[PDB]
Protein backbone atom coordinates (compact mmCIF):
# COMPACT_ATOMS: atom_id res chain seq x y z
CA UNK A 1 0.00 0.00 0.00
CA UNK A 2 0.96 3.72 -0.18
CA UNK A 3 3.21 5.08 2.66
CA UNK A 4 3.44 8.73 3.84
CA UNK A 5 6.53 10.36 5.41
CA UNK A 6 6.64 13.90 6.79
CA UNK A 7 10.11 15.43 7.09
CA UNK A 8 11.03 18.58 9.08
CA UNK A 9 13.13 21.46 7.59
CA UNK A 10 16.96 21.37 7.62
CA UNK A 11 18.19 22.61 11.07
CA UNK A 12 20.32 25.31 9.28
CA UNK A 13 17.25 26.48 7.19
CA UNK A 14 15.07 27.25 10.28
CA UNK A 15 17.93 29.02 12.13
CA UNK A 16 19.34 31.27 9.39
CA UNK A 17 17.02 34.04 8.14
CA UNK A 18 18.79 34.18 4.67
CA UNK A 19 17.58 30.56 4.07
CA UNK A 20 14.13 29.15 3.21
CA UNK A 21 12.89 26.44 5.64
CA UNK A 22 10.44 23.88 4.25
CA UNK A 23 8.44 20.84 5.38
CA UNK A 24 8.49 17.84 3.00
CA UNK A 25 5.58 15.38 2.46
CA UNK A 26 6.84 12.25 0.71
CA UNK A 27 4.36 9.69 -0.72
CA UNK A 28 5.83 6.32 -1.87
CA UNK A 29 4.47 3.10 -3.53
CA UNK A 30 1.63 4.59 -5.66
CA UNK A 31 0.24 2.13 -8.29
CA UNK A 32 0.53 2.98 -12.04
CA UNK A 33 -3.28 2.45 -12.39
CA UNK A 34 -4.38 5.20 -9.96
CA UNK A 35 -1.49 7.72 -9.65
CA UNK A 36 -3.57 10.78 -8.58
CA UNK A 37 -2.31 12.04 -5.17
CA UNK A 38 -4.03 14.94 -3.36
CA UNK A 39 -2.22 16.88 -0.63
CA UNK A 40 -3.90 19.08 1.99
CA UNK A 41 -1.54 21.06 4.23
CA UNK A 42 -2.62 22.34 7.64
CA UNK A 43 -0.69 24.77 9.90
CA UNK A 44 -2.06 24.76 13.51
CA UNK A 45 -5.27 23.15 12.15
CA UNK A 46 -5.77 25.82 9.44
CA UNK A 47 -5.47 24.82 5.75
CA UNK A 48 -2.64 26.54 3.82
CA UNK A 49 -2.23 26.72 0.00
CA UNK A 50 1.46 27.64 -0.63
CA UNK A 51 2.61 24.00 -1.29
CA UNK A 52 4.44 23.02 -4.49
CA UNK A 53 3.80 19.42 -5.59
CA UNK A 54 6.86 18.20 -7.54
CA UNK A 55 6.07 16.20 -10.77
CA UNK A 56 5.51 12.43 -10.08
CA UNK A 57 8.86 10.56 -10.44
CA UNK A 58 8.84 6.97 -11.80
CA UNK A 59 10.64 4.19 -9.83
CA UNK A 60 12.26 0.95 -11.22
CA UNK A 61 9.77 -1.24 -9.22
CA UNK A 62 6.85 0.28 -11.33
CA UNK A 63 5.82 2.57 -8.39
CA UNK A 64 5.41 6.36 -8.12
CA UNK A 65 6.99 8.83 -5.66
CA UNK A 66 4.90 12.05 -5.28
CA UNK A 67 6.49 14.81 -3.15
CA UNK A 68 4.85 18.04 -1.81
CA UNK A 69 7.09 20.79 -0.39
CA UNK A 70 5.71 23.51 1.91
CA UNK A 71 7.74 26.69 2.58
CA UNK A 72 7.51 27.72 6.28
CA UNK A 73 8.43 30.81 8.35
CA UNK A 74 11.54 30.42 10.59
CA UNK A 75 9.64 31.96 13.54
CA UNK A 76 6.59 29.74 12.87
CA UNK A 77 8.67 26.49 13.02
CA UNK A 78 10.79 27.75 15.99
CA UNK A 79 7.68 28.96 17.93
CA UNK A 80 6.10 25.46 17.73
CA UNK A 81 3.49 25.53 14.89
CA UNK A 82 2.17 22.02 13.99
CA UNK A 83 2.45 21.08 10.27
CA UNK A 84 -0.11 18.49 9.08
CA UNK A 85 -0.06 16.66 5.75
CA UNK A 86 -3.26 14.90 4.54
CA UNK A 87 -2.76 12.49 1.59
CA UNK A 88 -5.75 11.27 -0.48
CA UNK A 89 -5.57 8.35 -2.99
CA UNK A 90 -8.22 5.86 -4.32
CA UNK A 91 -5.91 2.86 -3.48
CA UNK A 92 -6.30 3.99 0.18
CA UNK A 93 -9.38 3.36 2.44
CA UNK A 94 -9.06 6.66 4.38
CA UNK A 95 -6.62 9.61 3.78
CA UNK A 96 -3.25 9.29 5.64
CA UNK A 97 -2.55 12.17 8.06
CA UNK A 98 0.97 12.92 9.39
CA UNK A 99 1.81 15.78 11.84
CA UNK A 100 5.22 17.30 12.76
CA UNK A 101 6.53 20.18 14.92
CA UNK A 102 9.93 21.31 16.40
CA UNK A 103 11.89 18.87 18.62
CA UNK A 104 10.67 19.06 22.24
CA UNK A 105 12.76 19.45 25.42
CA UNK A 106 14.58 22.33 27.15
CA UNK A 107 17.21 23.57 24.64
CA UNK A 108 20.83 23.59 25.88
CA UNK A 109 23.71 25.73 24.53
CA UNK A 110 26.52 23.70 22.85
CA UNK A 111 30.15 24.38 23.89
CA UNK A 112 32.46 24.48 20.81
CA UNK A 113 36.11 23.28 20.98
CA UNK A 114 38.69 23.04 18.18
CA UNK A 115 41.28 20.27 18.44
CA UNK A 116 44.48 20.42 16.28
CA UNK A 117 46.03 17.32 14.53
CA UNK A 118 47.91 14.75 16.66
CA UNK A 119 51.75 14.87 16.61
CA UNK A 120 51.57 11.30 15.12
CA UNK A 121 49.35 12.46 12.20
CA UNK A 122 52.08 14.91 11.06
CA UNK A 123 53.80 11.93 9.29
CA UNK A 124 50.82 11.73 6.81
CA UNK A 125 50.32 14.05 3.77
CA UNK A 126 46.78 14.89 4.99
CA UNK A 127 45.93 15.86 8.57
CA UNK A 128 42.68 16.04 10.59
CA UNK A 129 41.25 19.12 12.32
CA UNK A 130 38.57 18.45 14.88
CA UNK A 131 35.47 20.17 16.15
CA UNK A 132 34.13 18.87 19.45
CA UNK A 133 30.60 20.25 19.94
CA UNK A 134 29.02 19.13 23.23
CA UNK A 135 26.22 19.81 25.75
CA UNK A 136 23.57 20.60 23.14
CA UNK A 137 19.87 19.82 23.27
CA UNK A 138 17.96 18.77 21.14
CA UNK A 139 19.97 16.86 18.44
CA UNK A 140 18.95 19.31 15.61
CA UNK A 141 22.27 20.95 14.64
CA UNK A 142 24.35 22.12 11.64
CA UNK A 143 28.20 22.12 11.68
CA UNK A 144 30.42 23.56 8.90
CA UNK A 145 34.09 24.34 8.11
CA UNK A 146 35.48 27.44 6.31
CA UNK A 147 38.91 29.05 5.54
CA UNK A 148 39.61 32.68 4.48
CA UNK A 149 35.78 33.08 4.37
CA UNK A 150 35.34 30.41 1.67
CA UNK A 151 34.02 26.90 2.75
CA UNK A 152 35.94 23.58 2.87
CA UNK A 153 35.00 20.64 0.64
CA UNK A 154 36.69 17.90 2.71
CA UNK A 155 34.73 17.58 5.96
CA UNK A 156 32.40 15.03 7.64
CA UNK A 157 30.37 15.43 10.83
CA UNK A 158 29.37 12.54 13.15
CA UNK A 159 25.66 12.12 14.09
CA UNK A 160 24.77 13.55 17.57
CA UNK A 161 25.73 11.03 20.31
CA UNK A 162 23.86 11.01 23.67
CA UNK A 163 26.04 11.98 26.67
CA UNK A 164 25.59 10.68 30.31
CA UNK A 165 24.06 14.08 31.37
CA UNK A 166 21.27 13.66 28.73
CA UNK A 167 22.70 16.28 26.33
CA UNK A 168 24.27 15.54 22.91
CA UNK A 169 27.80 15.67 21.57
CA UNK A 170 29.39 15.39 18.09
CA UNK A 171 32.70 15.71 16.21
CA UNK A 172 33.20 17.37 12.80
CA UNK A 173 36.38 16.20 11.03
CA UNK A 174 38.16 18.49 8.55
CA UNK A 175 40.77 16.91 6.25
CA UNK A 176 43.44 19.28 4.95
CA UNK A 177 46.87 18.69 3.31
CA UNK A 178 49.70 18.84 5.95
CA UNK A 179 51.35 21.93 4.30
CA UNK A 180 48.05 23.87 4.61
CA UNK A 181 48.22 23.48 8.37
CA UNK A 182 51.97 24.29 8.57
CA UNK A 183 51.62 27.83 6.95
CA UNK A 184 49.34 29.14 9.68
CA UNK A 185 46.18 28.99 7.52
CA UNK A 186 43.16 29.72 9.70
CA UNK A 187 40.28 27.20 9.71
CA UNK A 188 36.92 27.97 11.29
CA UNK A 189 34.25 25.65 12.68
CA UNK A 190 30.82 27.29 12.48
CA UNK A 191 28.01 25.77 14.57
CA UNK A 192 24.28 26.46 14.17
CA UNK A 193 21.85 25.58 17.03
CA UNK A 194 18.62 27.21 18.49
CA UNK A 195 20.19 27.62 22.00
CA UNK A 196 23.25 29.60 20.68
CA UNK A 197 23.03 33.42 20.69
CA UNK A 198 22.24 34.51 17.07
CA UNK A 199 21.78 30.74 16.26
CA UNK A 200 25.51 30.87 15.33
CA UNK A 201 29.06 30.55 16.74
CA UNK A 202 32.49 30.30 15.09
CA UNK A 203 35.66 28.85 16.62
CA UNK A 204 39.05 29.18 14.91
CA UNK A 205 42.08 26.89 14.65
CA UNK A 206 45.63 27.53 13.29
CA UNK A 207 49.29 26.52 13.94
Amino acid sequence: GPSVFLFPPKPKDTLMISRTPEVTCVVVDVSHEDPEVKFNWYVDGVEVHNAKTKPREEQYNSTYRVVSVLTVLHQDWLNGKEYKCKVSNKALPAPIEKTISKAKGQPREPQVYTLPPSREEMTKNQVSLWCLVKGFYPSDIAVEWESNGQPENNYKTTPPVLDSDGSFFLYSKLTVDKSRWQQGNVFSCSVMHEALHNHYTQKSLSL
Binding site: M16, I17, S18, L73, H74, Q75, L78, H197, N198, H199
Partner: protein, 34 residues
Protein backbone atom coordinates in the same frame (compact mmCIF):
# COMPACT_ATOMS: atom_id res chain seq x y z
CA UNK B 1 26.57 35.66 4.95
CA UNK B 2 25.15 38.86 6.51
CA UNK B 3 25.77 38.54 10.29
CA UNK B 4 23.91 41.84 10.98
CA UNK B 5 20.76 40.37 9.32
CA UNK B 6 21.21 37.22 11.52
CA UNK B 7 21.72 39.37 14.70
CA UNK B 8 18.64 41.52 14.03
CA UNK B 9 16.48 38.39 13.40
CA UNK B 10 17.51 36.49 16.60
CA UNK B 11 16.78 39.70 18.62
CA UNK B 12 13.34 40.26 16.93
CA UNK B 13 12.57 36.49 17.35
CA UNK B 14 13.31 36.77 21.11
CA UNK B 15 12.10 40.41 21.85
CA UNK B 16 9.63 39.94 24.77
CA UNK B 17 7.77 43.19 23.88
CA UNK B 18 6.55 42.03 20.41
CA UNK B 19 3.32 40.19 19.56
CA UNK B 20 3.12 37.66 16.63
CA UNK B 21 2.02 40.39 14.10
CA UNK B 22 4.76 42.87 15.27
CA UNK B 23 7.50 40.17 15.40
CA UNK B 24 6.50 38.77 11.96
CA UNK B 25 6.56 42.31 10.48
CA UNK B 26 9.99 43.08 12.03
CA UNK B 27 11.48 39.72 10.90
CA UNK B 28 10.10 40.31 7.36
CA UNK B 29 11.82 43.79 7.18
CA UNK B 30 15.11 42.16 8.28
CA UNK B 31 14.88 39.21 5.81
CA UNK B 32 13.95 41.34 2.74
CA UNK B 33 16.40 44.21 3.44
CA UNK B 34 19.61 42.26 4.38
Amino acid sequence: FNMQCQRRFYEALHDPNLNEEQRNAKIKSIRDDC
